[model samples]
Target: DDEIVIVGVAGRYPKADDLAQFWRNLREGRDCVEEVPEDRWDHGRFYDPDPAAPGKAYAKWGGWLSDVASFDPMFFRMSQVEAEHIDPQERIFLQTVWHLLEDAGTSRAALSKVRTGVFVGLMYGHYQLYGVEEALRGTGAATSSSYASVANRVSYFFDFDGPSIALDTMCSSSLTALHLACRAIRDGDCEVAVAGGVNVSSHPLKYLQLAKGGFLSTDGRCRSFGEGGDGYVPAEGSGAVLLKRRSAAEADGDRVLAVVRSTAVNHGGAGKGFSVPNPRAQGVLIGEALERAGLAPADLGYLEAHGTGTSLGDPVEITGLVRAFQGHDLTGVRIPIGSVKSGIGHAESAAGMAALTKVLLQFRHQELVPSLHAERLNPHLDLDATPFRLQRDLAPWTPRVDATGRALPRTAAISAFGAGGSNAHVILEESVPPTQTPAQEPPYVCALSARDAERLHEHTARTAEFLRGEGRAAHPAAVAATLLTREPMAHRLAVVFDTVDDLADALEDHLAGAGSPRVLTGTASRAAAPATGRTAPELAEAWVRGAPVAAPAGAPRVSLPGYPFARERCWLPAADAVRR
Candidate 1:
């Protein structure tokens, strides 16, 4: 009952809009750090080499999202004015969660009025700082930028009945929130939950403050576990995962990405400074989590470290990790350790989710991706004497063994330490191999849809690519089962095929603007009307003609292509009133 499984994932990162692209960027060891875009702020006005310069940031680089301002207002049934006034953090999170639910193979209607909790980790509402004055003159805009609104808005919009919490613990916010979410499910506070974090750089003031506090990297990159070990790069993004108890997930025929074995949170009490990390507390946090997981240090095959790439922080974090395995003999046990920040910079509040998502992708691919900017090891400590080794290249993640040399399930740990004394650690084990289902006879139907035709085409193109790529092994019945899990929209397309190749060809025909008899398209009249047919093709035609065609009961759900949103720029242009 205490075990929580990750069923779905959604996120937007520095160089990637979704988790698939993020995985590709990580696997290729690409650097996503770059200078802040002018749309967020005038770098010329805020950046200065002199740290003492008033109202100026000494650093100019960060991991920035392409366009935080773009959103689809009508899709969420919100007026343009309301969308503009809401914080972009909330906006991005709203859209990402919708993607998350679809990825989980659960519909919005399935969760409506259900005991689903919402936990969002956020540092602050920076978007409010720039648009507060203008929003004050509007109706019901006072709560637009409220921190409580972040989680509350999700719950209200989705009609969830469990706790809606938005909390801040600096950099460790998301992991702490994950901790709370796991406990909530174990304690029956909610049957399921969505937990993650989001960060959007909307004002220059935050940069100025972080620069003054000696947190921003001047070179605009994080070299975690590397020789230079300078300050961390500030980044912006949003990420979240759908969580369900393992028992519940298995019973529901949901795909289990990874199992959350145990999670623990603690404060670095009375450290040398307010922001100073406590090695003792961090060690205890790790030990407690491992104890709850019923495992020892040797059981872990990898460790996702909170390596911020700061001179002091890197050393302190290593010390805490060393303290965790204090008395154990580790001459032969060497666990691989790495950080995600080295590639995408530090996402601050969202950093934990970034790290967790990286680990999830590794679990799925069954390989360890490289950690960037670590060509030269840090000089402060020698890694040879420790049980941990830096993962510097892409390698197969081999399974661990026990004293008898029998293979054991792969287990991993993740750490997230906050600047405000909060520390969190989580232990995760790879999910058990799914039971194989016999392949169903062909002549399968694959359904696709979006809010409009353009997005529907994009969705079709992506689905075809997925079938030919990562989804190649997916059974046609499994594809249909997963498609039926999503909520039906106005514009829809359904195709029948005797083989996966034929399905791809049919989708390609539609994308290439060619007519195919196997492919049928139509607009739904009423949402979820029962289908009137017996066979697969007949059922598909009925579905395309505004019917809710049923999928084979108990069919396993697989990860499928998600909906494509048609976004438009929605933002308050400038903050001239207060500045002038």
Candidate 2:
């Protein structure tokens, strides 16, 4: 299919740093909900049972990521002062984009001239409002007013030439961004697309307002699609994915994670109330995307439900879902479905990417991550009677058999609905990786580099450590390919080896300064890196002399650990400037 393809995805959810760990926690039925951390807000200071209570909240828990204040301003070439002044969302998005490229194994240097677009979904301009009155006093003057910089800065940093946009449609922000990105790719507006959303829990008054409005669960955690669908937990999260045309990804040797067959968006268009969802309209939205994909509801193996765990919302969503199924004669075969919110809480703007990332992982693993707290399904919806089932336990996504009993490729869908009733749904087909021919070379060279001495050592250690986990995928050829085209830094090192075992053995010694003859190190500040097509001794000499190195043969890149940031705390003066 000539469609937008998802090549790479990365994010930070509660209790997990990478998507793999997030999927693992989801599959294990492990819930990451916890009481509000001390770093966020004082739960005791604002606790109240009454919804009408002033400046108080009923929920005591939510999903929160750690280390919000620390940032690596040096990596993105931003001054520490500016990084401190910028919103945490902007900072996180910048770092997440770099990780996203690394995950795609797309070199920043390589993408310098590409027509890439940056579309970010962000909810609040919280930082600008953090210390308002004190800001007139110059204390808040340093903060940025460009909320769009959340997306704008990423493109600016990477020198992307295509359009840059920051969209805010409440919870559906990121999903809507994906829809627009796909459209851009389809329209030939951009050759490559970077799209996602971020939500940061920066202020307690924000939570107080949501709570006072009766939008938070009185009990702890999100209770998505369950009988306890009172409300949802408020949390902070950021997610991103790299999208490209299927043809471009294949041509670039990019790992095709999943093919985004089609995406569609719609508004509820006057339901029971302004904030309420329209069941029929949502059904139409899902149906429209299926139509675009030339697919039926029955063709889907799984659905990533926009299950925010709200009393009014859950039933309406299910009604719309079932209605969509009824359109395609998908009656008797109940579809497998689950909600990531049950584990990570509702991420608001970043929620859809979280769910979308889960679906991609499931397609590859052929497994269904269980939806926690759905032991007894929501009594409002007759799930068993309808063609729907909540996965209560971890299980593989059994391949559907054709008439000849052969397994068919898996297909899935994901959904996101916003508070303002704008909805989005995406249809995806699993990408079967093409078989690779073995490298016939005798020895392979892997290059590693970092901006600073500490980061250089850190980078080396991480590479060696990743080999421990991805032992088989850490072949010399694979490592060498990444090394050859790996994103550039100020200081660099290269090692040549005949086998994975040989390279692993050499890494420790070279990193410890007991350098091997095959090890070549250079600092751009001192001399240029070695040119390619050079022997180990020649490359080492050129590295010492600081010459330009050559590129790789474009081997596949592994999803190894990304760059470890040397984060330093950069607190803004708003701490004492706010009147709250």
Candidate 3:
């Protein structure tokens, strides 16, 4: 309890544009589902390994982000060469961590001296790198790198000199990441740490594998807690939370977002099947988290269930939730329940952070997002059977208050269960009040490209418009974009703007329009474009000029610049790939 405090939170999810919008979506009970993108899976001949079960092919429908093609690489400091190489999922991790630090008002310099660490939940290899290797084999950049190495890179980039672990506990990865991060702090390994998860599922190979396993729905919808529920819809995104010792956070004057009241993790102990859900283990973990938090079930006002929409998964979670809150007066309390997967689909390793981020934001807004597609509760799961209440409407309900005339110590129990039966439950206390401080002025940064000055201008203008339209305001010193053209294709263009919101808008619009530029954003050191196998200074000049900067005759640069924008980048290599 004394070892960790959440100082900041950052995430990118589906249906919801940003964390703020995500909170709104949760409260509104919006369903972000449509036909699964053609690229994500094959539509014809629902493949059923069991020929006897012919028509029983799982529906292929799913909730997917509609805007991945618009990501810009300039923000992530990735080079066109590197962007092609880095996995989108890995980039999500980099971007989310960058934003988490920014949102906390912490800096790389601030974390340099402290024993900071990183714990991440990762699923697969950096598939994006595979693409990059295919494109640049002759360049002698065929270094083997694991997506897990992202943790170490964060430590190196931020000067964090403590444990950096990349955990692979399936869906429970982020929760496990938080658990380990807290333990590291408690054990004196680090005073501060960045922990969360990232996952990208746009790749065809990955999708095919998931489809074969019957993990995806053919209709593209996730029906958690519904009668027709079938399977889950895999989604892509990343989330990061800044964790510091309670005392350290207080000493540093960091605004606490929430308190890490308690956490518990355990295995299913040889379950019936490798992926079978275990209610007993789930109950134990939740109970342990509550005990560790020093609170009774009555203190909890919400339970962010791991409702993955699988016919088997939903009921197992319901049993766990009911068992944990059995004796409490949860009836009128309406302990609002929901799932991030309901909106964005499950982000695998990133799912835990995505859900946690949603809950934290809900605590901020005092309303819960309705679980989309959750109509009639499973006949087996009696909604009125438990002490808690399920929020079925798209409206806000005030949390029950205690005798102190303050909202009861509103608590939420979050569950993250992985494929291998690894499960984690965390209890978080909504301790921080929303801040009313006036928004600060935006900061500005410069970008220079080696070619296409007009394209640079148009790109910058489009970026600014995107930000404005999205209601985001970018900081003056951090606004960055690039220039692109074919003629001579050598002279670079540079453009500078005042804020992140501007850069995001321009990049989003640019990607939506021409669809060939690779855009990157987030709080990490900004590159303004993908690394082109050049030095930092060259990249910086390219970012300012709004054009690609050619590397000097024979200079070897390993890392790229650190761009501090607080949004994830979109990489689209061809205009034909652009949706609109």
Best by lDDT: 1
A best-first ranking of the candidates according to their TM-score comes to 1, 2, 3
Model 3 ranges off by over 4 Å: 1-3, 36-59, 63-79, 126-145, 325-334, 433-580
How are the candidates ranked when ordered by lDDT, highest leading? 1, 2, 3
Task: Provide C-alpha RMSD values for all models, in order.
Answer: 2.4, 2.5, 10.2
Clashing pairs in 2: 527-546, 528-546, 528-547, 529-547
| lDDT per residue as tens, model 2, 1-580 | 5778999988988888777677778879888888877765566777787777777787778788776777899888889988778888998888788888888887667777669998989877676665566667875555763757887888888888788999988888888999999999888889899999988877677678788778887776567778877888877788899999888888887889998888989898877889788899889999888889888776778888988888888998899987786746655576888888988889889998888888888987789988988777789876776767888788988977679999888999899989888888999999888778566474666677777879888888877776755554655666666655557677867777777777767887887778887777777655454455456545545544445455444465667677778888865766533222
lDDT of 3 by residue, 298-379 (tens): 6676788787888888888888776766555554545667777777787788889888998887776676667777667667
- The sequence of per-residue lDDT tens digits that candidate 1 reaches over residues 1-580 is 4579888888989999888889999999989998877666667877798877877788888888988988888887788777777889988998889889988889778777458999989997877776555456772353256767889878888887798999999889999899999989888899899999999887778888888888887677788888887798888889899999888888777888899989999999898988898899999999888889887887788999998988888888888988988866666788999999999989999999999999988888889989988899897856767877889898999998778998777888999999889998988888876786766677778887788988898899999999999788877788888898888888889998777778999999988878698899998886555565667788788778778766676787777767888787878654433232
Winner by lDDT between candidate 3 and candidate 2:
2
Error of 3 at 321 (Å): 2.7
Q: Write down the RMSD of candidate 1 (Cα, Å).
A: 2.4
Better of 1 and 2 by lDDT: 1
Q: What is the model-wide C-alpha lDDT for candidate 1? A: 0.85
